[PDB]
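Module 6 notes. Inverse folding takes a fixed backbone as the condition and produces residue identities as the prediction. Think of it as a translation problem where the source language is geometry and the target language is the twenty amino acids. Below is one complete input and output pair. Work through it position by position during the lab.
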């Protein structure tokens, strides 16, 4: 349940409760926080 515009939005608020669920998401989907999908362009 995490893509680019949501992650950038959640951390901007300052609430780690909403982002409880990355640690399932990165692992079972083969995702990293250095991919082009989780990084803005240019």
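Target side of the pair, the amino acids:
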């Amino acid at each position: 349940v995490f893509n680019r515009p949501i992650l950038f939005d959640i951390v901007s608020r300052g609430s780690t409760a909403d982002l409880d669920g990355l640690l399932p998401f990165l692992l079972t989907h083969k995702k990293r926080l250095t991919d082009e999908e989780f990084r803005e362009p240019s």
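Reference fact for the lab report: The chain has two helices and no strands.
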